[PDB]
């Protein structure tokens, strides 16, 4: 009598609502635009289910696969990674004029009073996370669509790094921000996950910020309709993307921060101690039509943590390091000015300030980015001009291989000064 937690994807909105009240299906999720929901029935209504060929494609298990720059107030000179970046400030007198493009971020929510970024802070957020939040194990998750506040932390890190515009300053201080909330308390779903990537581009937000990644097992081998792998999750994330490019917005991702080179599939299975046969992926990083971030420290050379190899990363952004932590130890590292100078500070979920490192703090750099190349060369009805823009005039050609920092470490300053060119 068992009850488990199925993702479905089914061919047709009509149809599929025709046969969830026939069979009175319990849909606890659900995304008609990519025409895939969350069911929650037993593995006997679930290989029944199987059987609609015309109306279900596949089905699998859900699984676990997750500007003030000088007064005395000011941080900006503690920030050495958007230092680094924007020729210590200096790109923020090359600022658009209007800044229109609206930044959205999937992540743990944000703290919308911090002080930094209470002003770009969005209304239009929404949570994902539904009633009862993950797996229904978290009843205090009450499925308000407005709620957003950030229970774990990490989005209202990120957001810092896009928007701050107080004490510390981010890429784009002056553009909005709108957070979609993923995450509970708990774990996330990518179903909640490819759900928050529609609504951020339906709600015109060219350029949509994700930090989180997950290494997902799909295997191409088999074609059954009921299968062993998370099928449904990888092609609804895949859509998810595609809708959203189709849609104009851009989708910047997080390369993962195991410091693998994701071409060795060996290393990759290692990360989900799988043993099939059988592909690991790392997603939505290595996922098509995504611009992959990569993390660097503050010499500029790629972060020890981060992922990287041939066909994934795109570009390369400060994130920091540990390698000071790991040469000294604790008491050193803390005591001795080695934390500031490896990690990012960035505003926390306290309303005040946080050193981290990772790519989801180099990732949200470029996303600022993008949206401060489309307010500046008007790309937004062709934002993969600003794309190519970012590759090839806004970032550093002094970093290299590409298999490790793509087309090389984010300069905001050559992005914004195209038209301003020196001859030397
Ligand atoms: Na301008």
């Not at 069979?23 to 289910?49: D, G, R």
Request: glycine share 6%.
């Amino acid at each position: 009598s068992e009850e488990l937690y199925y993702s479905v994807e089914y061919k047709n909105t009509a149809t599929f609502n025709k046969l969830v009240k026939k069979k009175s299906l319990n849909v606890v999720y659900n995304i008609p635009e990519l025409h895939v929901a969350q069911i929650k029935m037993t593995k006997m209504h679930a290989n029944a289910l199987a059987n609609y060929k015309n109306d279900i494609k596949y089905i699998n298990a859900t699984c676990s696969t997750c500007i003030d720059r000088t007064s005395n107030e000011s941080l900006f000179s503690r920030q050495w990674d958007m230092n680094k970046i924007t020729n210590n400030g200096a790109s923020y007198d090359d600022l658009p004029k209007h800044a229109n493009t609206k930044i959205a971020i999937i992540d743990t929510g944000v703290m919308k009073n911090h002080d930094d970024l209470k002003n770009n802070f969005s209304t239009d957020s929404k949570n994902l996370v539904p009633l009862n939040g993950f797996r229904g194990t978290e009843p205090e998750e009450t499925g308000d669509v407005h709620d957003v506040n950030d229970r774990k932390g990490h989005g209202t890190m990120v957001s810092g790094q896009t928007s701050a515009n107080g004490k510390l300053i981010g890429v784009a201080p002056n553009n909005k921000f709108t957070m979609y909330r993923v995450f509970g308390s708990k774990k996330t779903e990518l179903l909640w996950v490819s759900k928050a990537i529609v609504q951020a581009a339906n709600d015109g937000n060219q350029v949509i910020n994700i930090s989180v990644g997950s290494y997902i097992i799909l295997d191409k081998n088999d074609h059954q309709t009921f299968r062993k792998d998370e099928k449904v999750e990888y092609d609804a994330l895949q859509k998810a993307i595609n809708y959203a490019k189709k849609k104009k917005s851009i989708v910047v991702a997080a390369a993962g921060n195991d410091g693998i080179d994701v071409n060795d599939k060996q290393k990759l299975k290692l990360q989900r101690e799988y043993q099939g046969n059988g592909e690991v992926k790392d997603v939505p990083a290595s996922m098509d039509n995504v611009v992959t971030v990569g993390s660097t420290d503050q010499k500029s050379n790629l972060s020890e943590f981060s992922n990287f190899g041939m066909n994934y990363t795109d570009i390369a952004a400060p994130g920091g390091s540990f390698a000071y932590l790991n040469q000294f130890g604790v008491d050193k590292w803390m005591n001795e000015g080695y934390m500031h100078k490896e990690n990012i500070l960035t505003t926390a979920n306290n309303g005040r300030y946080i050193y981290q490192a990772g790519t989801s703090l180099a990732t949200p750099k470029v996303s600022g980015a993008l949206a401060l190349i489309i307010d500046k060369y008007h790309l937004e009805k062709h934002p993969d001009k600003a794309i190519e823009l970012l590759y090839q005039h806004g970032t550093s050609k002094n970093n290299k291989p590409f298999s490790r920092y793509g087309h090389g470490e984010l300069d905001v300053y050559k992005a914004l000064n195209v038209a301003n060119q020196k001859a030397s």
